[PDB]
Design a protein around this ligand. Structure first.
Ligand SMILES: CC(=O)N[C@@H]1[C@@H](O)[C@H](O[C@@H]2O[C@H](CO)[C@@H](O[C@@H]3O[C@H](CO)[C@@H](O)[C@H](O)[C@H]3NC(C)=O)[C@H](O)[C@H]2NC(C)=O)[C@@H](CO)O[C@H]1O
Ligand SMILES: [Mg+2]
Length: 528
């Protein structure tokens, strides 16, 4: 049998959890076990690729959508995939909203079975983007989950799935192997037999394995990639197409009064931003991979057509390396060194040191923070790097105990993915929410604009809304955007061919969970 060795995530040890609704799951659950109704190819104009649904139809008023389910699709246990599974899954997320990690509940009023192969979503608001938003919600088997006592703690260790790889062939603390669904509806197009998923804890362990040609499909940071990895074997390849924003997020609800006095001050956030040398961060921490992001709104240069250039220009100076301007702004805001240590105190005279966190083992981000600490010191801002394990880093954001965090964001075909995930205050509440909105800045007007972005399909209307969003975020310097990154992706031709690449650029090539196109990609791979 052919085994494809993949690394969608690092772990200290393999914990058997295939619940697609829990933040604690394994990152081969979505797509590979639970196939979507539709996969949107974001790189190719956000085009739908129909999988378990064969079609959808939005109502004229954009307030409802029906999906026609493909006939003849089976769960891995042999039972039919039907509208009942879609109705059940959305009903579960309404009953247990802690499982609604994307906040779909607010947008979907009801999900009803029309017949065995047709489901109707009634929406709470007109929403031209709802097919995409629905496409991300995992669909589980009603005939299994109806008998689950507590879906919020169920580890789903024996998953029944619709996707290509549902058989748990091997499971050990150091390795699991996920083999092909024997009843897979699209078996005729699937040539890979199993996913081999070794336990790897961090970038340093990853580097040894990747250089030694032990892996097939990864999306890791690899330092000095041309020298360490690409030159090590003629079969070692990579393709890094452009992706989304990375930024320092500041906690507006910090529990320390001196830190809150700094972090909550827009002039301080701007001075912090002007202390940073974004191009040096890119050159040193990312080995040159990335583009400076000097948009106070975080928009980035790839989305310039969505940008109000007057807004970009008005705030760009606060997002440009400018030590002189940073120091002048600190002084003008009243942040002065009143105790002779070379570090500013708050305007009320309090000392403070900002703890800047990034996830342990994400060495590109760790090195970014170290550079930022040195750059902040030059303007008199005292800071220290912290590298908690991801779960602790994430919990500190969900609990509001962090000071500053370096993070990336997901990245869609338009700016809404970044702006909504990064700023909608509705995404700040929920045990299964991700970290991206957890700065605790809130603005009802901003939320209203985000919630209105797709109320029409009119591009001119969406543009005016985008300009309003850009203005609010920029004028509040909510975060400190640093760069636009890349979809890191490395592939090995030793054991498989058919990979996406710059020469074969079929979609986002990442193996990370949250990139639904990885299902389409795996179906193109052919064993050697
Ligand atoms: C429950 C669930 O599915 N969560 C998904 C997230 O796992 C996923 O976030 C991305 O996760 C990967 C793996 O942890 C991150 O990759 C790491 O990135 C750092 C920083 O560049 C790099 O140093 C590491 O090498 C790299 N690790 C690996 C194993 O490749 C990635 O940065 C995360 N991206 C974001 C925006 O958070 C998200 C995103 O795909 O989807 C969730 O569903
Ligand atoms: Mg001082």
């Amino acid at each position: 049998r052919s085994e494809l060795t993949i690394v969608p995530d690092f772990y200290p040890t393999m914990v058997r959890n295939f619940n697609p609704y829990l933040a604690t799951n394994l990152r081969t659950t979505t797509d590979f076990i639970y196939e979507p109704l539709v996969v949107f190819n974001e790189m190719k104009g956000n085009t739908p690729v129909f999988r378990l649904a064969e079609s959808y139809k939005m109502a004229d008023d954009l307030m409802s959508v029906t999906f026609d389910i493909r006939k003849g699709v089976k769960w891995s246990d042999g039972e039919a995939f039907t509208a009942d599974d879609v109705v059940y899954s959305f009903g579960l997320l309404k009953a247990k909203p802690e499982l609604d990690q994307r906040g779909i509940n607010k947008w979907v009023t009801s999900v009803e079975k029309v017949d065995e192969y047709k489901v109707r979503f009634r929406l709470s608001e007109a929403n031209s983007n709802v097919p995409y938003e629905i496409s991300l919600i995992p669909i589980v088997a009603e005939h299994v989950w109806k008998d689950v006592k507590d879906p919020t703690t169920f580890t789903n260790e024996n998953p029944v799935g619709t996707g290509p790889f549902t058989v748990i062939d091997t499971f050990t603390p150091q390795l699991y192997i996920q083999c092909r669904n024997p009843n897979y509806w699209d078996a005729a197009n699937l040539e890979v037999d199993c996913l081999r998923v070794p336990q790897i804890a961090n970038n340093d362990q990853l580097l040894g394995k990747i250089v030694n040609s032990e892996l097939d499909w990864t999306s890791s940071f690899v330092p000095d990639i041309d020298r360490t990895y690409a030159a090590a074997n003629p079969n070692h390849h990579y393709w890094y197409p452009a992706a989304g924003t990375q930024a320092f997020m500041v906690n507006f609800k910090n529990p320390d009064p001196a830190k809150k006095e700094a972090l909550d001050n827009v002039d301080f956030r701007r001075a912090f931003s002007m202390a940073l040398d974004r191009q040096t961060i890119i050159d040193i921490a990312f080995y040159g991979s990335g583009t400076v992001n000097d948009f106070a709104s975080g928009l980035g240069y790839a989305f310039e057509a969505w940008s109000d250039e007057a807004t970009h220009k008005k705030y760009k100076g606060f997002n440009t390396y400018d030590v002189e301007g940073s120091k002048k702004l600190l002084a003008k805001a009243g942040f002065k060194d009143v105790n002779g240590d070379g570090f500013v105190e708050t305007p009320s005279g309090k000392s403070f040191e900002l703890l800047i966190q990034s996830p342990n083992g994400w060495t590109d981000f760790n090195n970014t923070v170290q550079l930022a600490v040195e750059q902040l010191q030059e303007v008199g801002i005292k800071a220290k790097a912290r590298t908690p394990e991801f779960a602790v880093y994430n919990q500190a954001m969900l609990e509001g105990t962090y000071d500053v965090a370096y993070t990336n964001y997901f990245h869609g075909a338009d700016p809404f993915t970044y702006w909504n995930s990064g700023y909608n205050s509705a995404l700040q509440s929920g045990d299964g929410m991700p970290r991206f909105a957890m700065h605790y800045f809130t603005d009802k007007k901003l939320d209203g604009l985000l919630d209105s972005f797709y109320k029409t399909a009119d591009k001119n209307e969406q543009l005016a809304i985008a300009h309003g969003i850009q203005k609010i975020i920029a004028e509040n310097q909510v975060t400190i955007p640093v760069m636009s990154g890349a979809w890191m992706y490395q592939y090995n031709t030793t054991r498989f061919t058919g990979w996406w690449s710059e020469e074969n650029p079929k979609g986002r090539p990442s193996v990370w969970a949250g990139i639904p196109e990885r299902l389409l990609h795996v179906l193109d791979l052919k064993p050697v």
